[PDB]
Design an enzyme around this catalytic site. Sequence first.
Site, PDB file in Angstrom:
ATOM      1  N   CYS A 197      -6.073   3.630   5.449  1.00 27.54           N
ATOM      2  CA  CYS A 197      -7.337   3.217   4.833  1.00 27.54           C
ATOM      3  C   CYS A 197      -7.221   1.952   3.952  1.00 27.54           C
ATOM      4  O   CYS A 197      -8.225   1.516   3.358  1.00 27.54           O
ATOM      5  CB  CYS A 197      -7.931   4.368   4.032  1.00 27.54           C
ATOM      6  SG  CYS A 197      -7.904   5.932   4.883  1.00 27.54           S
ATOM      7  N   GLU A 206       6.525   6.958  12.862  1.00 27.63           N
ATOM      8  CA  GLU A 206       7.150   7.587  11.709  1.00 27.63           C
ATOM      9  C   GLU A 206       6.795   9.060  11.652  1.00 27.63           C
ATOM     10  O   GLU A 206       5.792   9.464  12.248  1.00 27.63           O
ATOM     11  CB  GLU A 206       6.686   6.879  10.418  1.00 27.63           C
ATOM     12  CG  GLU A 206       7.821   5.969   9.897  1.00 27.63           C
ATOM     13  CD  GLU A 206       7.302   4.798   9.053  1.00 27.63           C
ATOM     14  OE1 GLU A 206       6.073   4.849   8.714  1.00 27.63           O
ATOM     15  OE2 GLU A 206       8.092   3.811   8.811  1.00 27.63           O
ATOM     16  N   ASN A 219       0.839  -1.198   0.000  1.00 28.22           N
ATOM     17  CA  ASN A 219       0.000   0.000   0.000  1.00 28.22           C
ATOM     18  C   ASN A 219       0.883   1.261   0.000  1.00 28.22           C
ATOM     19  O   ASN A 219       1.749   1.436   0.870  1.00 28.22           O
ATOM     20  CB  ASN A 219      -0.989  -0.075   1.184  1.00 28.22           C
ATOM     21  CG  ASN A 219      -0.445  -0.923   2.352  1.00 28.22           C
ATOM     22  OD1 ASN A 219      -0.692  -2.157   2.440  1.00 28.22           O
ATOM     23  ND2 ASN A 219       0.346  -0.282   3.229  1.00 28.22           N
ATOM     24  N   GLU A 271       4.463  -1.061  11.821  1.00 28.78           N
ATOM     25  CA  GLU A 271       3.134  -0.596  11.657  1.00 28.78           C
ATOM     26  C   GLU A 271       2.329  -1.702  10.984  1.00 28.78           C
ATOM     27  O   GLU A 271       2.688  -2.155   9.893  1.00 28.78           O
ATOM     28  CB  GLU A 271       3.164   0.715  10.861  1.00 28.78           C
ATOM     29  CG  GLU A 271       1.784   1.352  10.785  1.00 28.78           C
ATOM     30  CD  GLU A 271       1.122   0.972   9.499  1.00 28.78           C
ATOM     31  OE1 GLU A 271       1.764   1.185   8.442  1.00 28.78           O
ATOM     32  OE2 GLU A 271       0.012   0.417   9.536  1.00 28.78           O
TER      33      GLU A 271
END
Lengths: 482, 482
Positions: free
Chosen positions: A285, A462, A154, A251
Site C-alpha cells: 500500500c 518472499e 517503506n 519487488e
Amino acid sequence: PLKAQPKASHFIDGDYVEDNTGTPFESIFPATGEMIAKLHAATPAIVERAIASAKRAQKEWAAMSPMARGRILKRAADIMRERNDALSTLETLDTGKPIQETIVADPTSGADAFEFFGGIAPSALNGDYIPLGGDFAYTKRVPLGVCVGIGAWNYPQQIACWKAAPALVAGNAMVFKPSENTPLGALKIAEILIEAGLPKGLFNVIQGDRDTGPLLVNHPDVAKVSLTGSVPTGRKVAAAAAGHLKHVTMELGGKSPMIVFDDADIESAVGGAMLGNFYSSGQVCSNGTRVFVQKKAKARFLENLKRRTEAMILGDPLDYATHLGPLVSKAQQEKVLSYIEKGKAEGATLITGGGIPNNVAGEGAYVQPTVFADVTDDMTIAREEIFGPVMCVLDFDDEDEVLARANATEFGLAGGVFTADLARAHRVVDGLEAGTLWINTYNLCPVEIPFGGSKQSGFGRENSAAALEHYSELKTVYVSTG
Amino acid sequence: PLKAQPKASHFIDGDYVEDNTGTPFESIFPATGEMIAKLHAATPAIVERAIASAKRAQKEWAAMSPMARGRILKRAADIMRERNDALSTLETLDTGKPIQETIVADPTSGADAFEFFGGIAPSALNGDYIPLGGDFAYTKRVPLGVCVGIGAWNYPQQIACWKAAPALVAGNAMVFKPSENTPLGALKIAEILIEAGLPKGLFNVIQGDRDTGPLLVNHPDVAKVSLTGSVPTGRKVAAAAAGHLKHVTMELGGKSPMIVFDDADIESAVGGAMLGNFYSSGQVCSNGTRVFVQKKAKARFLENLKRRTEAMILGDPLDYATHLGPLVSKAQQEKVLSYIEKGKAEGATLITGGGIPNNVAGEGAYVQPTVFADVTDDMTIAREEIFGPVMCVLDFDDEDEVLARANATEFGLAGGVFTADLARAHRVVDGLEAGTLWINTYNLCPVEIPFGGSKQSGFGRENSAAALEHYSELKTVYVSTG
C-alpha cells in the site's frame, strides 16, 4: 546529543564501524524536521570490508545443521519481541509512520519471518533421494554464498528481516544496505542477531550512497542480489547483477486493483480501501491502490468511507492516537496538492479532504485524507502513481469490463475482490494478473504465505518455504553403485 | 534436391514458414563439407509472427489441465522414439557427431524429457493449501507466458526438448531459436509436436543470425528466456532480459574437474575421462574436463588410458563403427594442433595422439585423440578450454590440495570423483563447487534428476520436478472466511 544517534553508521563483523570520509547524510523526523542521527554512506573500503567479512564467515555457517542455524534466528525473533516498543518507536522516528501501526505491523512482522524460517528449516531445506533402478542420486539445497540486500523506505525493519531470515537459514551471509532515508532500524536488527548468537560477519549492514548500491551489486564475491525499490532502480540493478551472472530477486511495487461488487460486505470493503490508501504503507500500500466499485454499491461505499475517513485523527506519529502522520517534506505536501488540483481540474468529484487541515498543528506538513470519485481511466490522477493519502474510486458496471481495466497496467503486485459470491470470487482472482490476491479482505501478508509480484513488479517470492528457492540452489550427486 | 532440405527455414503456428529476405546461411556436413541445407535467418516480421502466435495460443493451453497437457507431450515422445533412426541420422548430419552416440544419447534424451514432464505434471504442478487458523490461502503454479529458448550446437535436439518439455507442461508457449550451426533437428521437434496434437503456435522454431537473439530477448511479449551457450553470450542475454525484468535461466558450460584418487577403479575412471574429453559431445562434456590423478594411480591410469585411446576408431560419423568424427572446419584442425604444439613446448608430456591420422580420411579434417601428462595449473593447456579431443591429466598429492585446485576456477558446472572410500566420496562431492556431481562414473544425466550450473556456469535447473520452478510462478490467494 541527537535523539537516535547509532554508535556508528555501519555494523560489520560483530560491532559498529565508522568511516567519516563517506558522504554525510542525516535522518530527519518528518513531524518536527528534527535531526535524529548523522550518518556516513559507505566508502569503497567499507564496502570491501563488509563483503570480505561476510565471505569469511559463511562457510562455517553453511556447515552447521539447519536446526542449529534455525535456533539463532528464533532467539533473534524473541529478542525483537522483548524489544518491540523501542524498535517500533525507532521505526516511527525513522519513517514518520504512526506508532499505532508500527507497533503491530513492522518489527513484529520482521520477527515473524525470523521465527517462521528458523522453525521450518529442519524440514523445508531437505533435498531428494531419487531412485534410478540400480544407481541413485540425491540433491542438496546449498547456499549461494554472500547475498546483498537493498532495502527501501517503506517498513524498513520488515524488509531487512524478510531478506535476512531466508538468506541466513539457508546458510548464506548477507550484506544489507538500508535506504538512505531509513538507515537506523537495520542496525538494530544486526545488533540483535549478534546478541542471539549469530557469528560475526554473517549479517552486516552498511549505509549507502548513489555509489554504494552499484559497488555491492557488481562485486565479484556477491552471489545474489535481493532488492525492494522502484522500477527504474530495479531494471538497472537487475541488468547489472544478471550481466555478472548473479542470482536476482526483486519487488518493485505498483498500485494494485481492489474490486468491490454490489454484493460486497461494504464496511469490510471500505476498511480494505482505507488500509490500501490511507493508514496504508508497507510493501503493498506504499504507493496506493485503485479502487473499483460496482454501480449499485457506489453510494453505500462513498458514505461509509466519508464518515470513517473524517474520523481519522491526524497528528504526531509518536502519539498512539494518531491514525495519519504528516508527510516527509513540504515538497511532498506540494506535489500531493497539485495532484489534488490536477484531479479537481480533470473533473473528478471531491468526496472529502482536498486541503491542509486545521487544527492539528504543528510543526508537520499535513494533507487531509482525501477521496476522489467519478475517476475514469484516462485521468491524470488514475494514471500517475503517488505517495500520499489519496484514494481514486472508479465506477464499473460489469465483471468483464473491470477485469480488462484492472489488468491493463504494467504492474502486477497485488489485487483483491469483495464479493459474497463463491463463483465470482475465485473467478476474479484467477483472472487478475498479480502475484498476491485477497478475497474479502486486503493487505494481509502472514509470513506463512508467499509474497511478491508479477510482470513489471519484479520476480521471486518472499515468505513461505518458497522463499528458500531464491537463497539456495540444488546440488545433485549421482551415485554409481556398480 | 539438397540432402536435408527442410520445407522452410522456420516452423511457425502449425506449419513451415519462409522469408527469403533474411540473411542466408548453410548447414554443412562436417565430414564431406557437403551443403546439406539452405536457410534464412529470421527477419523482424518472422520474429513478430512467431511471438504473436505463441501469445495467442498460450491462453487456451494454460486453461487445460496438467494431465491434458501432459498427454500431448507423452505422445510427442512416442513419436520421437518411432522416428529415432531418422531423427538421429539427421542429428549426425547436422552436428558431425557419430551415429553411435547420436542413436542413444540425443533425440532419445529429448524424448525422455517430454515423457518425464508429461507424466509428472498432474502431481508436480500442485500448489499449496495453507491453513491460517480460520482464514486460509492457496497457491497456484501459473505459467509465465511466452518463453524464448536459445539453443547451442552440442546435442541440439536434446536442448530443444529439455527446454520445451517443462515450458509447455507448465502452460507456457515457446519460441525456440536453434544455433546457426545446427538448425535442422529443432524443426522436426516442432513438426512432431503438432503431430502429437500440440495446438498450433505453442512451439515455434525460428532460425537466427547475430540480430535474432536481441530481437527475441528484448521483445515486450516475452516473459522468460532460457539459454544454453557460452559465457560471453550468456552475460549479454542475461543483462538484456533482466533489464526488461524478464525471468532468465542459463547453462553456460565450463571445463569441470574429474578427481581420480589412489583407491579408485582405474578402468572405470579411465572410461569416465574418455567420455569426458573424446566421445564427449555433452552439454557437460563439449568443452573438456581437467582430470586430476593421485600419485599412485597415475601409472596404471595412463597405461590403461593410452591403450584404450589408441583403439578408438576415427572416421565417417555416419558409420556405426566410428567412435569419433572429424572436426567441423579445417580451421578447427589448425587451431587445435597449435594447442598441441603449444602444450608440448610448455613441457607437457605427450602420451598419445598429437598428429593428423592416416588415412582416416577422406574427406574429413581429423586430429588424433591426444593426451598430456605432467601438466600443471600454470600451463597454457589447463588455462585455456577448447573443443577437440585433448585431455589434460594433472597430478596431485593430497585431497585438500586437489579440492582447492578444482575449485580455483570461475566455472562450476559439473565434476566427478573416483574413490572406493565412502567418506572421501561424500566429502569430496560436498567440497566441490558445482551443480552436478558424479561418484564413480561421469556424464550421466537422467531426466529424473536436476541438471545445471553454479558460479559462472549459470543458474536454474533443467530436468526433475525442479525445472518447473523456472517456468511458472506462485500466485497466492488469501481467502478471508469470516
